[model samples]
Target: EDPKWEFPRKNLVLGKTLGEGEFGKVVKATAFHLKGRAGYTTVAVKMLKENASPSELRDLLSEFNVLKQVNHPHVIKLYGACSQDGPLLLIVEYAKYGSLRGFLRESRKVGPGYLGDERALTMGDLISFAWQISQGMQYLAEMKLVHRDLAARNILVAEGRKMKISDFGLSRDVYEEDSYVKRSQGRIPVKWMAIESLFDHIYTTQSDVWSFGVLLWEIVTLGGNPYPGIPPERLFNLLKTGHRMERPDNCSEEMYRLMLQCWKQEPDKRPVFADISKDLEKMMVKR
Candidate 1:
């Protein structure tokens, strides 16, 4: 049976902005679930833009429904939502360190191996980040869900170098197709896509596995742009001929080989996320 996972919007005290995007701005907020409670607890509120289009609003509500049904330690938690006659609001678990891309980007600014604030990125940090995301993707695969947009920017990092998958704006059920046909032409990140997806628009769990490989690349490169300077129009043709990214600086031969496996042209040839997680763990053990 389905039920509403609603939050008390009236009691939501919105605070400073956390970050923003086209859909809405995420902010720090206090939520009072208990009317007689002494104090409210802190939560991250993703407030839908006031003038969001009908389609945009629909997507937000759909994401709320999808997130509420998905529960995993490595997946971002949906605390609740507010949909009582005002802008749509999503209350989610707060991540102490924000997004993985942001964390990595900050580190890139300071120089390799160090966070923006000069804290060094441990070898374990790099390996664990990739492993956690693979674990999360394996969970989603089991649930028959496809995270259409799986990227480092969509991953959240909490304390203890823990990572969680977030952002289901483009998620959908795992449908059968050699490629997901493009209903209409629009901007889609083509570099992270599998060969089939890039050309035919077909997508499946295997495609997500392809994205995970890119995600792993993101970690090793400390958030470098995928495909670097290659023109978007050329990506499909290039990938068709087996143009793979060069190994990141300091990237091990074994890890690079795994990336190559994930980038295999054929869907079946690509390894599943579960196996990828185990492989990453084995690498972690040696580190």
Candidate 2:
């Protein structure tokens, strides 16, 4: 059984802001544990923005609950939360390297070294990133959750290139035994979305697979924008007409083949996350 996982609001000491979003803002903070509890020197705290909707506020609490249920190294760790006597707060482990997209963008500017190191990121490093995210998504797939917003921006990296999937605002909890879910919400990434999801807001694990391919492109290109310069209005038709993103300059033929499989027109035609993970492992072995 999962406990409330709640912490005392007063124990949270807010520091500098880490990042901000419409619903909430994340800040660097210190969590001072009470008697008989453990303390963390530093952590990230996500608190609701003022005047947020009741639904948004409810999700702050529910996100904690959801985090408590899932446990995987590739998923963000929910240390605890504050839901009483004050603001709603989610305590999560801090990612040393920040978001995958931010990491990639910086890499493009300064070259591909993990965590801003001057040394360039090797091909093996890129493969490791793809493999780690696939493993994370594979875990989410197994747990029957659809991370509709799967993207480089939602992935966090630790000191050693460990990837953890985050941002569950668009996630769906599927009750079906077959891992299917309907309905949609959250800010959609137009270029990263599958055609079915773009036409109708329907999303599933398969849609996540579609987004995963775009993320792989990001990794291979050291963070190139998807369908670069193609407005959202034009992208759908282009995809509908059988146009797809060309392979990145440095991406291997083998890796590009996997990425192409992920973009197959039929959702069922895309490989499952497990298969993707296995293929990545095989690629790593070949390397």
Candidate 3:
């Protein structure tokens, strides 16, 4: 008997490759009769490259399982999987606007003075993004799933500026950059990682909150690089010495205060996702 999430390989029509890494790639596709729908629906297909190692395949399957468990408007959704055929396929929700980081950078380039762009990102829009992310993180916290990596690059911006958290286990490989440091445990997003995570190998919801602080900074600065001028090797020492990122230009005092709360040195001191979500909701309504 086939599982509910199993789909026939023939129903999928792959289009352009959205992203490709060493082990796997994600492509734009259309899935016919998805979930018994009448017509086809646009989706994202994630699959491994040819001759992918067994471990790599397992990793993809693990990510698929994780996505299967997740269900939230602010989190990426998995439509179905086609594992009975050639390469395994994971049909997932499509984010038309791509990564939030790219969206912020693109928005920054366009303005009233330069490109005369009418559609500009507003303070309310940024607050809404933060609010949505907190809501999603709250759901994950309730599910006891700690998102080890939470950053703007890992969040997808769909049509209408809807933000969805994505890139579960594949972020380090997909977004290889200077910010990612290679330690004995593999590549880690140093700037986004928490103090405990930087010192000891520990990942919890509280650690994710710390990353959320860095993400807030990214959003306020229009995807500006985190910890500017501070080398990854020196980050832990700096943090230990009570150094934290200053408020971004044009960032509200209240928003910066929330960031500071998220970046508390002790994990127990950091606000939980539930509280953070509530605070963000209030900020959106009040401001």
Candidate 4:
């Protein structure tokens, strides 16, 4: 018989509550597993509430499915998932370093939001990390998958700053030309969401790029949330009208240029992830 669904499935308990979202909470959990020769390893589990609707349920499952589809060293590895008949339980690779959000917050607390030479991600460091994100994004884009949610909070670091882009609760695969998910529905994270995703009720690879711009902004700004004041409803207009958030103090002119490029309204005009990664990689070498 199928593994009968169960809830509150037990795993390595890392902490009580790492953080709370609009409809779910991300707890830090650890587990042991054998992947190839890597045995008795640790992992992170993303637990979901039973209150999730059928759509949320689908999206959550979709995230796992998406990760399963893309096997990238930089992308957060999905070890496995579990569930009880009630709420949902997810088993993910543990990011001991936690989300980029916490990492950035800590950095700012120590050195303020402004990063510099060594403080700013070294070209080597940035490329080493950002390239991983790019590789993951490129792979996803090639597969026609749109990671609707792209932000610092979603980025993670492994040992030696090995990067992993995660939190695929909003990921989806588009097979048909017209087969795109639009509209802000079922626990939309407005702050990280792209303006077009809210206004046009449309999503495309390009929209994901826009969110990428935001992620870049987060990286440059030491993980600060954008438009902290403007309501989600007014985000599209404000951003579209050129009243968007500013980059951090330590960002290079090249970094700012890429940020602006990704946020372009004309989706096609935005440079591809490969280009972005290449430029970032070049900067890493120059420094």
Best model per lDDT:
3
User: Which residue runs does candidate 1 get wrong by more than 4 Å?
Assistant: 1-4, 34-38, 109-118, 175-182
- Each candidate structure's count of clashing pairs: 4, 1, 0, 9
lDDT of 3 by residue, 1-287 (tens): 13978998899999999986334898999999999898899999988888788767876776777887779999989889998877788888999988888888888765531121224777878888999999998887777677777988889998777889987763322122212333456334788889887887667778889999999999988889999998899997999999999998868889999999999998889999899888888888885
Off by over 4 Å in 3: 21-23, 51-55, 111-118, 170-186
**Would you give me the overall lDDT of model 4?**
0.68
TM-score of each: 0.90, 0.90, 0.88, 0.82
**lDDT for each residue of candidate 2 in 215-282, tens digit (9 for 90 to 100):** 99988887778998888889779989989999889889999999999989899999999999999999
Q: In order, what lDDT does every prediction score?
A: 0.79, 0.80, 0.81, 0.68
Q: Write the per-residue lDDT of candidate 4 for residues 8-99, one digit (tens) a residue.
A: 33433455676654335777665544233243456565766767776666767777667766778778877666654435666666666677
Q: How far in Å is the alpha carbon of 279 misplaced in model 2?
A: 0.9
Provide the lowest-lDDT 10-residue window in model 1. 110-119
Residue-level lDDT of model 1, residues 56-109, one tens digit each, is 666676677689789998998888877765767888888877889888888766
Better of 2 and 3 by TM-score: 2
> Which one wins by TM-score: 3 or 4?
3
In candidate 2, what residue range of length 10 has the lowest lDDT sum? 111-120
| Clash count in backbone of candidate 2 | 1
Model 3's C-alpha root-mean-square deviation from the true structure amounts to: 5.4
